[PDB]
Ligand code: HEM
Ligand code: HEM
Ligand code: HEM
Ligand SMILES: [K+]
Ligand SMILES: [K+]
Ligand code: NA
Ligand code: NA
Ligand code: NA
Ligand code: NA
């Protein structure tokens with residue numbers, strides 16, 4: 001095993017978080033499509049795809065380091081019952097994810113695994129972009145009203 | 158809830174099987190790429206993508222029937238340690254999957270859910286194609302020898 | 315030095331107004347984008363760019379007239395806290411800007427600097443178009459309601 | 471408010487440096503064009519545009535972190551009176567800017583704001599490329615002589 | 627001079643490793659071509675080219691920092707006598723060379739040379755990709771057998 | 783082994799000369815680029831690339847003849863401190879290189895290795911073209927003066 005054992009543990013923890021997000025965002029996407037809120041459904045689908053790509057890169061890095069990627073343990077999905085709950089639940093997940101990313105980066109730096117650190121910083125930038133999106137949507141609900149906000153997400157771009 | 162309760166249970170069971178296959182095939186794909194067996198890695202990636210598409214269609218059908226798609230419960234991945242074990246483990250998973258598909262189809266027919274039956278028959282045809290592929294690969298190992306078989310899967314098409 | 319000294323003072327005053335407007339509109343643009351009101355953010359960015367182009371022409375004219383362009387003194391930015399305040403603040407700024415432009419044109423005419431007058435008249439036409447836009451947006455808020463007005467500016 | 475308060479102070483300090491550089495380089499550009507040294511004018515315009523783009527990214531990051539971008543305080547422009555002074559003034563400004571960038575990156579690292587650190591590192595790479603350019607121009611003046619150096623920058 | 631003296635020493639040490647790798651990989655490439663293992667010859671040629679490009683970037687950074695690039699001291703090449711030995715020798719070089727890159731990055735971080743650190747991190751990612759390639763080839767020899775492995779590298 | 787042992791010694795001597803020139807010309811190129819003499823930098827880069835191609839052909843020929851190419855022993859680089867020293871150092875190196883080429887050709891002819899002779903004659907033609915270029919550049923410094931000569935090599 002060529003990589004640092006705790007680095008591999010951290011990468012598997014980030015991978016676990018991405019696996020939760022893949023499933024939660026994919027279900028939320030399809031719930032929004034089922035309700036006819038196709039613009040939200042499409043955007044949330046692309047969020048799910050982006051998490052899938054991050055998970056791929058984490059799996060490839062873990063194998064290069066001769067660790068074992070853990071795709072078996074799936075943590076808790078928090079599926080909302082309406083749009084505001086779904087957005088907030090995504091946001092709560094992202095805030096936990098960025099906490100775990102920052103701890104992983106600290107450890108990669110300490111053991112000089114600079115390539116793993118760069119991979120995680122790239123993922124972190126993407127997750128912060130997702131936080132930006134989510135906070136913006138919740139703010140729009142307040143500025144334009146829920147009924148208008150949902151109306152604006154019926155039809156795709 | 159507009160759909161038959163047991164139909165929705167069956168669709169969630171098939172969905173559960175697809176979720177196992179997504180992860181097992183994706184990891185097997187990336188293990189083969191890590192070993193430099195890129196033709197196997199590419200083929201197994203496309204198998205994983207195909208299971209993702211089946212899972213999407215099952216989720217959409219469950220929501221239309223006003224059921225709750227279960228993306229939370231992930232069953233047992235059986236990750237092989239070498240090519241022959243990985244192929245056999247995929248094959249064992251597919252044989253369980255087709256058993257469950259046939260039971261689901263029997264029940265859809267009994268309660269006259271002909272659209273759900275057609276969706277499952279489409280998935281079943283794809284899974285039998287995957288069995289065809291897997292049985293063929295294991296037979297090739299015997300006909301050309303393991304070392305030649307692996308050699309033939311180093312470079313992509 | 316070929317230029318009239320008071321013409322150069324006037325041109326530097328107009329330049330100072332443009333420099334305030336560049337920064338106020340740019341910040342308002344990025345606030346609207348942060349809030350997800352991308353159509354307002356995009357329009358306000360283009361207003362900021364237009365002020366940048368006016369400032370460029372003023373700098374070039376001042377240098378031709380052998381004056382010293384003043385980019386050092388930045389007057390008061392009035393940043394609003396919500397859409398209605400941001401639009402009204404831009405409008406208040408534009409009304410001050412057009413007052414100064416008219417006084418500058420009067421002086422250019424008196425000392426026969428007709429090319430500077432023509433430059434300032436082109437800038438004034440642009441600033442009056444911006445007043446038109448701002449008064450129209452504030453009127454639309456009254457006609458369609460605030461929530462609908464904001465909704466119509468979410469998407470570009 | 472998600473952002474670290476001292477990170478936002480640092481980002482506003484870097485923003486303040488960019489705002490000085492935007493105006494100093496833009497004026498230097500238009501001075502060089504007025505003098506007929508169009509190749510210097512064009513290059514310096516592009517330096518001003520690059521600083522504008524950095525300021526934009528800083529404003530956007532500050533707003534994401536729920537801070538208040540400061541476009542109101544404009545520090546000291548040091549406008550040169552001839553080409554050699556203008557280049558050295560830009561270089562003095564860039565050396566101050568890189569010192570502040572390094573101090574900002576240290577603090578971002580300490581509080582684990584790695585995305586802000588990455589933004590500042592990209593800006594720092596751009597500012598060090600500008601130092602490279604400036605040191606090269608000042609060296610060329612010594613190697614080819616001032617008159618030849620200016621001659622080579624008449625035409626674009 | 628602007629650069630930290632130990633940073634420049636570290637960059638010259640990395641440059642020295644790249645210069646060994648250029649020549650070792652180029653000779654290994656031409657040995658594989660002479661033996662008719664053209665797929666290995668072509669891949670190894672591209673590894674040598676990639677090291678040449680890294681060397682270029684390091685030379686440019688050393689000169690910007692006002693250090694003296696050292697292309698005179700060439701360290702020890704380890705030339706294999708068959709395919710297995712050549713791949714092992716490349717891997718030995720890469721493992722020793724990535725250790726030096728990590729030590730250089732630690733020092734850049736300590737003295738706040740973040741641009742040098744970023745350059746070395748880009749090179750390090752490339753060298754780890756080469757380690758990935760080399761370990762994979764040695765594993766394929768085990769999995770498919772040496773004769774099949776070489777057969778698969780006859781044709782481009 | 784098919785090759786004449788002294789032919790292989792001569793080919794390895796010529797290869798050693800090319801390896802010196804690759805590194806000397808590459809560093810001179812990057813020094814000229816650092817100084818903003820980009821036309822000299824580009825031309826010198828191309829000279830380095832041409833020596834790389836000659837080295838490749840020599841390596842291939844040695845391996846065909848069942849000799850061992852020597853990429854380990856790197857002779858003395860003579861790096862100039864300014865343009866006139868750099869050009870003269872390149873010229874001195876080329877004059878040594880052509881002396882060795884002629885002695886290698888004499889020996890190839892004596893032992894009837896006409897294909898090695900032809901390869902060396904093709905290299906010699908390229909090195910004489912480089913001598914032509916270098917002598918011309920030193921002559922231009924005298925004819926147009928150093929400051930004008932350097933000015934003419936600022937822009938590509
Ligand atoms: C281990 C977890 C997963 C990984 C690593 C993963 C990876 C990927 C990747 C790399 C792609 C290609 C994206 C692109 O290049 O644009 C993809 C596509 C896709 N994935 Fe996933 N995925 C995972 C789980 C899932 C799940 C659980 C679902 C749905 C329930 C899903 C649904 C999809 C769909 C619908 C596509 C697009 C298929 C198409 O091209 O038609 N994925 N996935
Ligand atoms: C807060 C301060 C400023 C910011 C954030 C800013 C930002 C920008 C940005 C992002 C662009 C587009 C650049 C590109 O994408 O190529 C731009 C264009 C430009 N800016 Fe600024 N700018 C600022 C101040 C100024 C000032 C004070 C002036 C002149 C006195 C100026 C002159 C220009 C010009 C001439 C253009 C090109 C317009 C065109 O496309 O015709 N900027 N600015
Ligand atoms: C044994 C020594 C070397 C050999 C045989 C060699 C050979 C080559 C060859 C054949 C090329 C392709 C040229 C073409 O076809 O146009 C090349 C490219 C190049 N070489 Fe070398 N080289 C050597 C050492 C070096 C060194 C020491 C440096 C710099 C320190 C260097 C820098 C470059 C660069 C920058 C390129 C262009 C690569 C690109 O942009 O794709 N090389 N070399
Ligand atoms: K509405
Ligand atoms: K075979
Ligand atoms: Na519905
Ligand atoms: Na936001
Ligand atoms: Na079959
Ligand atoms: Na109006």
Ligand code: NA
Pocket residue numbers: 601602603605606690816817
């Ligand atoms: Na320089």
Ligand code: NA
Pocket residue numbers: 191192193758761762765
């Ligand atoms: Na491997």
Ligand code: NA
Pocket residue numbers: 913914915917918
């Ligand atoms: Na000549």
